[PDB]
Swiss-Prot record, chain A:
GO molecular function: large ribosomal subunit rRNA binding; mRNA binding; mRNA regulatory element binding translation repressor activity; structural constituent of ribosome
Function: One of the primary rRNA binding proteins, it binds close to the 5'-end of the 23S rRNA. It is important during the early stages of 50S assembly.
Signal peptide: none
PANTHER family: 39S RIBOSOMAL PROTEIN L20
A cellular component term, taken from the record's GO annotations: cytoplasm
Organism annotation: Escherichia coli (strain K12)
Family of the protein in this entry: Belongs to the bacterial ribosomal protein bL20 family.
Keyword terms, alphabetized: Ribonucleoprotein, Ribosomal protein, RNA-binding, rRNA-binding
Glycoprotein recorded as keyword: no
Gene: rplT
Protein name per its UniProtKB record: Large ribosomal subunit protein bL20
UniProtKB/Swiss-Prot annotation, chain B:
One MF term in the entry's GO annotations: structural constituent of ribosome
GO cellular component, one term: cytosol
Family indicated by similarity: Belongs to the bacterial ribosomal protein bL32 family.
Annotated PANTHER family: 50S RIBOSOMAL PROTEIN L32, LARGE RIBOSOMAL SUBUNIT PROTEIN BL32
GO process annotations (BP): cytoplasmic translation; response to radiation; response to reactive oxygen species; ribosomal large subunit assembly
The entry's keywords: Ribonucleoprotein, Ribosomal protein
SUPFAM superfamilies from the UniProt entry: Zn-binding ribosomal proteins
Name used for this protein in its record: Large ribosomal subunit protein bL32
Segments for region (Disordered): 1-37
UniProt subunit comment: Part of the 50S ribosomal subunit. Contacts L17.
NCBIfam families from the UniProt entry: rpmF_bact (TIGR01031)
UniProtKB/Swiss-Prot annotation, chain C:
Result, substituting A93 to S/T/V: Abolishes translation elongation arrest of SecM
Other noteworthy facts: The wild-type allele (erythromycin sensitive) is dominant over the resistant allele, and is also dominant over the temperature-sensitive allele at both low and high temperatures.
Keywords for this protein: Antibiotic resistance, Ribonucleoprotein, Ribosomal protein, RNA-binding, rRNA-binding
Protein's recorded name: Large ribosomal subunit protein uL22
GO biological-process terms attached to the record: assembly of large subunit precursor of preribosome; cytoplasmic translation; cytosolic ribosome assembly; response to antibiotic; ribosome assembly; translation
UniProt-listed InterPro entries: Ribosomal_uL22, Ribosomal_uL22_bac/chlpt-type, Ribosomal_uL22_bac/org-type, Ribosomal_uL22_CS, Ribosomal_uL22_sf
NCBIfam families according to UniProt: rplV_bact
Recorded family membership: Belongs to the universal ribosomal protein uL22 family.
Binding site for L-tryptophan: K90
GO MF terms, alphabetically ordered: large ribosomal subunit rRNA binding; structural constituent of ribosome
The gene coding this protein: rplV
Subunit organization: Part of the 50S ribosomal subunit. In TnaC-stalled ribosomes forms part of the binding pocket for L-Trp with the leader peptide and uL4.
The keyword rRNA-binding is assigned to this record: yes
From Swiss-Prot, chain D:
Disordered: region residues: 1-20
GO molecular function: DNA binding; endoribonuclease inhibitor activity; mRNA 5'-UTR binding; RNA-binding transcription regulator activity; rRNA binding; structural constituent of ribosome; translation repressor activity
Lineage: Bacteria, Pseudomonadati, Pseudomonadota, Gammaproteobacteria, Enterobacterales
Protein known as: Large ribosomal subunit protein uL4
Keywords of the record: Antibiotic resistance, Repressor, Ribonucleoprotein, Ribosomal protein, RNA-binding, rRNA-binding, Transcription, Transcription regulation, Transcription termination, Translation regulation
RNA sequence: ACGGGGCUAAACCAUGCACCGAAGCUGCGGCAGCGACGCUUAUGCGUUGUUGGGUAGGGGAGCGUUCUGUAAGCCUGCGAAGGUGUGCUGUGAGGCAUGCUGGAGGUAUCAGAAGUGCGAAUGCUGACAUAAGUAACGAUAAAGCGGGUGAAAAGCCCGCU
RNA sequence: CCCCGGCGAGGGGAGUGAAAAAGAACCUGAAACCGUGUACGUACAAGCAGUGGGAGCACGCUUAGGCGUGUGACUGCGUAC
């Protein structure tokens, strides 16, 4: 019962080379290099699904800080004011309001300043 | 001395970017026979500047 | 109406013929024949015979006229290589590749 | 593998992977690492496990109504046309026929029929009783089978 | 719903004038770096230059504390062996006064193509006059 | 001999309050293991607790390949295998459908048997790259011209040097 | 059989055949490797070449659907097996 490996070996080499589309040079042409590139790409993707949640929160905080200082208060005192006012809007929404609705964001600063004062 | 890494096809193409041939700009036209020829060269039938210079 | 002529197994490497091929890519056949006449290259003689043979095919098989033909497509593919043995110093041997090429010229009025 | 035991090239200095034989299984045209030998695949079956399986098969056949019992089953001349006609009367196409005494006429008449085969009472085997859609046994055969299976 | 991102085609940039007379070099440079990068705008995005154009006047009148006027040294290497050049603060002021502020801000900007693009929006002048009146730059009392 | 810019605090000490900050914790959704309690099992479902980084290594459960039976069955010239795309699908090995190519075989299911899965062994064989149109063209005794032949002549023929 | 070519090689027609992209370097014709065409990117820019974010452009849509596909300026992180 001799088993020739040609059909299944080509199938799995194509499966790797298909995931390597768009890589430079041998990384999208030859299996040995493409296989390492695909594994490394999977490692980065796993790591960056966690980093994505840090980078976006870091971006929201920066935008909130900018919009808060336009109203005369820092991000630190603004967040502490909202918690003292029992407001539970998260940073993704606050950064969203800070860009698309200035007057609603100013109303939030007034609410935060009242809880501090 | 020899390469430590195989140069890419990209690097190979960049080196050959100066290997392109330059075609002759324009051929001259003889005033007598009207043939085309390299400037300052006699024509294929032995004319140069409107004169049969070689009878072959 | 495209018209093709080919020279397969031309005794010249594709890299050398491609230098001549890009001189006439897109030119009118009357202008291309003058370029090939005054190109001091061996490949220029090979390409010229394929070009003028494509012109003959266009006028005899397709009834086209020479005045409107243009070199719309031209490319040189690698042909089979002939393996040869060249003796080197100290009893070592090297394998010499006598490369060939396939020359393809496509003329068309459109 | 036909070849020489000569070392293809010296151990050190050539700059190639070390080799010891042109017959190595790593090499093209080399030997097979664990080349097969003519072997015997027959297994042992306990006498009671064999007989115990026939009883379980026979009892399953009567539960599936795949066992047909007749008093006798024979044909006059060894002609497959007669036997093919007889089975069509009984609405049987794929059937194993088991008789007490193996008649030559019944044996010859079934030789060319593909989905039909005759068998002596002592010649039954486990896969035949399962492979066929119907099993027709004469009253003499079932009597002999009971003595065989205690 | 994806987070908003500014677009280089639709971002507006204002022009500002800053008088560096008497300002502390570093505490002025940080405020410039913020506005050159756009950290003061709610539409700030890291990969887009949303900053403002800033004109700095009287760069030669910038102030430093301590003995830094004579002790702060600016090093740079010319790339030739042994070519390590140095210049103290007050001779940098005497020779190229605009370089002092440009160097300080350059160090506070991100490094890379975008950081170099932000630096182009900084116009530093030694004197009190500038020829960008056509841009109508607004006084930035910082 | 602050990571840099820079800093006379953006240093240090004391005290205080905020905030940032991890794959930690919480929230929401999903999977699996082990318990427990049961439904009441037909032996699975349901609650509940808890666990789920991992080399050497131990244990458990699978995918796919060739071949045998099932199979004188089923699929197939109204297009098989193979090749090449695409879409869908499963936790994974994978699977399903389909366009094109191909032009004659393929094979469910459940079992059975293995030459059963490759990126490495300075592995073996074939093909093709790279260096690169680079070095070299094998004695520094040496060639020049006219004519001829020829699709084409520095090298062949003839002639004179 | 005709045409180009050196009474070549090679090729284009015609014809044969179900098929000539079955033409004898002949079933199928994978990959490395080498080309032609088109879309996008690329000549102030530093490093395992990806990954997360992401403009613009091109194109398929649907169609105001605001989706798909290709490309990937710029930016966070990131020293193969
Ligand atoms: Mg977190
Ligand atoms: Mg032998
Ligand atoms: Mg053998
Ligand atoms: Mg026995
Ligand atoms: Mg956790
Ligand atoms: Mg584990
Ligand atoms: Mg198919
Ligand atoms: Mg291999
Ligand atoms: Mg390995
Ligand atoms: Mg080589
Ligand atoms: Mg070199
Ligand atoms: Mg040289
Ligand atoms: Mg040389
Ligand atoms: Mg010689
Ligand atoms: Mg002569
Ligand atoms: Mg011919
Ligand atoms: Mg073929
Ligand atoms: Mg540029
Ligand atoms: Mg980095």
């Amino acid at each position: 019962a001799r088993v020739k490996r040609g059909v299944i070996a080509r199938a799995r080499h194509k499966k790797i080379l298909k995931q390597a589309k768009g890589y430079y040079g041998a990384r999208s042409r030859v299996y040995r290099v493409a296989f390492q590139a695909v594994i490394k790409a999977g490692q980065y993707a796993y790591r960056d699904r966690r980093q994505r949640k840090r980078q976006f929160r870091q971006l929201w905080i920066a935008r909130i800080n900018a919009a808060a200082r336009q109203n005369g208060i820092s991000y630190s005192k603004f967040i502490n004011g909202l918690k003292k006012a029992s407001v539970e809007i998260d940073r993704k929404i606050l950064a969203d309001i800070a860009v698309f609705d200035k007057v609603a964001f100013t109303a939030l600063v007034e609410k935060a300043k009242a809880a501090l004062a | 001395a020899v390469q430590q890494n195989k140069p890419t096809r990209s690097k190979r193409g960049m080196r050959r970017s100066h290997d392109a041939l330059t075609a002759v700009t324009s051929l001259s036209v003889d005033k007598t026979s009207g043939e085309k020829h390299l400037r300052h060269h006699i024509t294929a039938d032995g004319y140069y500047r409107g004169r049969k210079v070689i009878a072959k | 109406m495209e018209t093709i002529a080919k020279h397969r197994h031309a005794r010249s490497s594709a890299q050398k013929v491609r230098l001549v091929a890009d001189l006439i890519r897109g030119k009118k056949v009357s202008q291309a024949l003058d370029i090939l006449t005054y190109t001091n290259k061996k490949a220029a003689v090979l390409v010229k015979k394929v070009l003028e043979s494509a012109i003959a095919n266009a006028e005899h098989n397709d009834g086209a006229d020479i005045d409107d033909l243009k070199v719309t497509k031209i490319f040189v593919d690698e042909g089979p290589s002939m393996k040869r043995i060249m003796p080197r110093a100290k009893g070592r041997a090297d394998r010499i590749l006598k490369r060939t090429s396939h020359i393809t010229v496509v003329v068309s009025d459109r | 593998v036909t070849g020489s035991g000569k070392k293809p090239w010296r151990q050190k200095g050539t700059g190639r992977a070390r080799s010891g034989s042109i017959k190595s299984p790593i090499w093209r045209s080399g030997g097979v690492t664990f080349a097969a030998r003519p072997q015997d695949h027959s297994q042992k079956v306990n006498k009671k496990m064999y007989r115990g399986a026939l009883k379980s098969i026979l009892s399953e056949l009567v539960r599936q109504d795949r066992l047909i019992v007749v008093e006798k089953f024979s044909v006059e001349a060894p002609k497959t046309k007669l036997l093919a006609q007889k089975l069509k009367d009984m609405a049987l196409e794929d059937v194993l026929i088991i008789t007490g005494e193996l008649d030559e006429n019944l044996f010859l008449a079934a030789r060319n029929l593909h989905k039909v085969d005759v068998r002596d009472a002592t010649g039954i085997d486990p896969v035949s009783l399962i492979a066929f859609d119907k099993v027709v046994m004469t009253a003499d055969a079932v009597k002999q089978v009971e003595e065989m299976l205690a | 719903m994806k987070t908003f991102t500014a677009k280089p085609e639709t971002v507006k940039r204002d022009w500002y004038v800053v008088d560096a007379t008497g300002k502390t070099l570093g505490r002025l440079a940080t405020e410039l770096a913020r506005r050159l990068r756009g950290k003061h705008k709610a539409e700030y995005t890291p990969h887009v230059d949303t900053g403002d154009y800033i004109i700095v006047l009287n760069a030669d009148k910038v102030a430093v504390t301590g003995n830094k006027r004579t002790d702060k040294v600016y090093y740079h290497h010319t790339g030739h062996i042994g070519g390590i050049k140095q210049a103290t603060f007050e001779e940098m002021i005497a020779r190229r006064p605009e370089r002092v502020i440009e160097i300080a801000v350059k160090g506070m900007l991100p490094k890379g193509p975008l950081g170099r693009a932000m630096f182009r929006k900084l116009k530093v002048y030694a004197g009190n006059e500038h020829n960008h009146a056509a841009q109508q730059p607004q006084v930035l009392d910082i």
